[PDB]
Each structure stands twice: as structure tokens, then as C-alpha cells.
């Protein structure tokens, strides 16, 4: 599977035919149908202590990965039971500026959408937690071109060491903090994972606030490679599903 003509996201459905279900994500936000819910509890985002690892060319998208034996960078609250560890994040890109995120706001698009997933504690670890309806909550966060975000900068300046599909490199004490936007006003659903197997087991938190980041780390982005070393080069952009059916479900907002 991958993002072009002959295998993205229109083909998924014969290896995944969960591509066809009914909670399947990303899906357009529509901001005047979305409700505000007041049973929603406070989102605490607690990554004081968050141990990163490595970051990896997957061939789709870069994995910044996480230490997650222990609980020492968690989601709770919001529309959550519970305590979910965070085992990494990625990012959605576009080849323009026009495009790239997953997730949409009354149809509006943004350049790209990062992705912080955790995993139920509940459940042991990641593999069994994707088996569950419960099991992963996605804090999903848009990017628009505009002023640079320095908390990125550490990501953009290693990607230059893992370009193509299969390079990893170490990637220690990196702050997943100077990630985030300054309000946590949410929308939540019940969906899926955006790639393959598109299992439905996530707890969407997509946060109302984008954050900026400039042309030029975006740019960087689109210097990835989807291709191996020594094969013929194909930027990695345009790695984001569009919008699926809503089908039966809410989006809950947790502010008026
Ligand atoms: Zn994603």
C-alpha cells in the first residue's frame, strides 16, 4: 500500500476492507454541527517526563518514537478512561501549501497534521491495544505555514540523515511539549488509524488551535524520500487519506 495512483487510498479497501467501515478516519469537522458536551472532563497532556528514542523513515512517513515502559508521557482526561502512554508521533504532509492534513475543518485543508498516538494501559502494550475500541487515543494537531515553530527545528534538522525509506537515527531527549499549540480546545470521535490495517480503535482528540511552522521546515519535509536507498527518488508528499464518511457518529467539541 502507499499514497499513489496505482495503491493509495481508493485501493486500500482489497488488502483492508475495514477501509469501508463505519468509523473510519480522518473525516471533515463541521464545525456547526460538532457539539459542545459539558460530561467532557479537563485533557491533561503530561509529557514532562517523555523519553524519545529514534526517528524513522517508515517509507510513508518519519516515527518519532518514544519510551513507553512506564508511564512517563500520558494522556488522560477529556473523553479518555483511563491512561494512555505515548509511543509516537508523525506527520501528514502536503506537496503545496493547500493541502496535507487528514483531518478538515469545515472543508478547509491545512498544510499538514501531526499525529501523537497513545496507547491504552489498560491493555498491556501497543499490539493488543490496536485490538481494542478503546485501545489508541490520537492527539491530532494541524500545521499551517506562517512563523516558524522552534520546537520542530530538532526534528527538521535530522531528517537530512534518515531521507529514505528505512534510515533510522537516534533521536534522544527531544521535547514533544514545544509541539503543542497554546489551548487545548478540542473536537473528539471514535474512528480509526489513518493508514493500513485502519483499525478501528482510536479515540480521535483533534485540537481546535493549529500550530505555525515556516515554508522552510515544511519544505524539509518534502525532501523525504518514500523510496529505499538506491532506488529511484520519490518525494514523500502527499502522505494523508482524505476524508471518509461520517456514517453514524458525533464529533463533540469541548468548548462553547
Ligand atoms: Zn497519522
Known amino acids: 500500500w502507499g499514497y499513489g495512483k496505482h495503491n493509495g487510498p481508493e485501493h486500500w479497501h ?7 467501515g463505519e468509523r473510519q478516519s480522518p473525516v471533515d469537522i463541521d464545525t456547526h454541527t460538532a457539539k459542545y458536551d459539558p460530561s467532557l472532563k479537563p485533557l491533561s497532556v503530561s509529557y514532562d517526563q517523555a523519553t524519545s528514542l529514534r526517528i524513522l523513515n517508515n517509507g510513508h512517513a518519519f516515527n518519532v518514537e518514544f519510551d513507553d515502559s512506564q508511564d512517563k508521557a500520558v494522556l488522560k482526561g477529556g473523553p479518555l478512561d483511563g491512561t494512555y502512554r505515548l509511543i ?18 469545515d472543508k478547509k485543508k491545512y498544510a499538514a497534521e501531526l499525529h501523537l498516538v497513545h496507547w491504552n494501559t489498560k491493555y498491556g502494550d501497543f499490539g493488543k491495544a490496536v485490538q ?13 505555514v506562517g512563523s516558524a515553530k522552534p520546537g520542530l527545528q530538532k526534528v527538521v ?3 537530512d540523515s534518515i531521507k529514505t525509506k528505512g534510515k533510522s537515527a537516534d533521536f534522544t531527549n527531544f521535547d514533544p511539549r514545544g509541539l503543542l499549540p497554546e489551548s ?5 470521535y471514535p474512528g480509526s488509524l489513518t493508514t493500513p490495517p485502519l ?25 523525504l524520500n518514500f523510496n529505499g536507498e538506491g532506488e529511484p527518488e520519490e518525494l514523500m508528499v502527499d502522505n494523508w487519506r482524505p476524508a ?13
Request: proline share 5%.
Open 184 to 188: 487545548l480546545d478540542y473536537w473528539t
Open 14 to 20: 482489497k488488502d483492508f476492507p475495514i477501509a469501508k
Open 132 to 144: 481494542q475500541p478503546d485501545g489508541l487515543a490520537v492527539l491530532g494537531i494541524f500545521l499551517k
Open 244 to 256: 471518509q464518511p461520517l456514517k453514524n457518529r458525533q464529533i463533540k467539541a469541548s468548548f462553547k
Open 88 to 105: 509516537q508521533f508523525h506527520f501528514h504532509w502536503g506537496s503545496l501549501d493547500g493541502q496535507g492534513s487528514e483531518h478538515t475543518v
Open 157 to 159: 534538522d535530522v531528517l
Open 199 to 223: 483499525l478501528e480503535c482510536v479515540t480521535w482528540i483533534v485540537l481546535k488551535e493549529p500550530i505555525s511552522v515556516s515554508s522552510e521546515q515544511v519544505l524539509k519535509f518534502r525532501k
